[PDB]
Every structure is written in structure tokens, then in C-alpha cells.
Amino acid sequence: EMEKEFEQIDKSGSWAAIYQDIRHEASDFPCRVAKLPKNKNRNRYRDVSPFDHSRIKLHQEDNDYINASLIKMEEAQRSYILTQGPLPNTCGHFWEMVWEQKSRGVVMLNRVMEKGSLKCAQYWPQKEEKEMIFEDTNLKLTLISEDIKSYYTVRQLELENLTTQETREILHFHYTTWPDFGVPESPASFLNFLFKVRESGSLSPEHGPVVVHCSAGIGRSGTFCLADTCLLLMDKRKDPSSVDIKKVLLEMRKFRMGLIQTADQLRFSYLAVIEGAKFIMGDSSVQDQWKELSHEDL
């Protein structure tokens, strides 16, 4: 049971060992497509690649490769697409994927610039009147509205397939205070954001999988998806004790390497699930407490 395991691990100071155990047990599958010479400039990081078996394929015959993985959680009945922060040459690919996979939401957990370096291309428009056209994939993207909070912003975007002139509304959930290789400022602040995404419908089964990314698409992105899946499993059976966080994480790592990049992100994942369990197990008021503690206004 996770709350007792947490205290035992905290007490023995063994988060690094638990986390290394996860790394050692984690799946290893081939990433041959990601490593083809022609895809070199489609990967942001040499040591973060999608597995062939779970990679998202673009529906184009030129080159279907994007650094993106489908994390299909069968028992939880939720899917996520985890991807790297788009590169200056893959922003068209990114929105092609969103279009083809029928996603409603994009969850961005990084800033464009972190630690003085560029982690992500500016892949969405920042001004309503300056829309973006991705000529290679023939898509148009317009900023419709934004709702800026103290540590996250929600944007309403309109994505248009210029070939057919079909349009879709995409919601962009941008977490702006979560450091690279770091953790959110509090469980309450993480959970407030996650439940904002949930409320939007972006994680729901009538849409394609939510697209989640940070810079590499494994650390913060893994923490977000791990917490979400654990809370959903707990919700399905109202049985917190039946949820084994580490096993869930190992399951997720069958679909993309390296999910959860530090032992402190693992520890934070436990904290977030433990605190989220209060809401799942019937204390609806805790959602308002998180919003208060998160100080989202201003």
C-alpha cells in the first residue's frame, strides 16, 4: 500500500535505490526507425527515442517518423501520446500528429527556455492576429483565447486542415513553473493543473489521446501521466490499496523509455497520487483546497 511504502522508503532514505531498481527492470525494445540517418534531425536528444512498436506514425508517405510514443494503458482505459518538445523543423509534424490522432488537448510541462537554453520550439501562436501556417503539413493554427494563471496558462487554439478546410479546437495546457529535472512546487499545485486538464475533456475517451510533452517527453511528462493513470485506476475500483505505483510505471515504460527521470520525480509522483486519493475517495472539497493552495490567481 502506497502510503506505508512511502513512509518506509522515506525513513530508510532509499528513493535512489527504488528508482534505480525501476531503471534496471525497465523494458528495452528497439528504436530502429528513430535511429535511421534520415531521422537524425527529427530527434531532440540522442538518448531519448520512441520504441518502434509504440511510435506514432505520421500519415504521410515521405517520412512518417516523429519522436512520439503511444502509451496505451489497458487496465486504466486511457491513452497518452508522449513526445519531445517540437524542433524548428518538426512543428508541422507535431500538428499533423495532433490532427491525425484526433487529440483535443496538448499538455506542455516545460518552458521554451529553461536554464538558459532552448528546450522547445515556439510551436503555437502567441498573438491572435499572428496565426501560423505549417506549409509542409498544410495546417493552419490560430490562437483564439488564453487564460493566464500564476503558474499555468490555458490556450484555446483552432487547428485547420488546409487541404479540407476542416477545423478543430485544440486546448493547450501550459505548466510554466515546473523545472527541468525538477518537481512541481506542491502536490496541490500539480493536482489542480491535472484536474483542469481532466475537466476540459482532453483526457476523455471520445477524443484521441492527449499529447503530453516537456523537453524530452519522459520526465515531467511521465510524472503527469503516471499520476493520472494511478488516480484513474484507484477511481475505477475505489481501492487505493490495489494501486502499485511502481508496477504502473514499469507498465508505462513498456511504451516509452525513461519515464520519470529522477528519484525525486518518483517521490513526487507518490505524493501526488496519495494526495489525489482524497478526492477520488469522496472528499470533493479537497479540489477547492488545491485551487486555493495553488494561488493560481494573478
Numbering used by the authors: 2 to 299
In the authors' words:
However, low-contour electron density can reveal hidden alternative conformations in protein crystal structures. We therefore investigated the electron density near the WPD loop in the apo structure more closely. Surprisingly, upon closer inspection, the electron density strongly suggests a significant population for the open state as well (left). Our re-refined model with both open and closed states as alternative conformations visually accounts for the electron density around this loop much better than the original model (left). By contrast, when we re-refined 36 other available crystal structures of PTP1B complexed with active-site inhibitors using both open and closed loop states as putative alternative conformations, Fo-Fc difference electron density and the bimodal distribution of refined occupancies indicated the single-state models were a better fit. These results suggest that, even in the crystal, apo PTP1B samples both WPD loop states and that active-site inhibitors then lock the loop either fully open or fully closed. To better characterize the conformational heterogeneity of the WPD loop in apo PTP1B, we collected X-ray datasets at several elevated temperatures including 180 K, 240 K, and 278 K (‘room temperature’) in addition to the 100 K (‘cryogenic’) model from the PDB, all at better than 2 Å resolution. We built an initial multiconformer model for each temperature using the automated algorithm qFit. These models are parsimonious in that each atom has alternative positions only if justified by the experimental data, and a single position otherwise. The WPD loop adopts both the open and closed conformations across this range and the population of the open vs. closed states was sensitive to temperature. The loop is approximately 67% closed at 100 K, but 65% open at 278 K. These occupancies evolve non-linearly at intermediate temperatures.
One system that would benefit immensely from an improved mechanistic understanding of allostery is the archetypal protein tyrosine phosphatase, PTP1B (also known as PTPN1). PTP1B is highly validated as a therapeutic target for diabetes and cancer and has also been linked to Rett syndrome. Transition of this loop from the open to the closed state is rate-limiting for catalysis. By exploiting a new multitemperature multiconformer X-ray approach, we have identified a collective allosteric network that is contiguous on the ‘back side’ of the protein, centered around the quasi-ordered α7 helix.
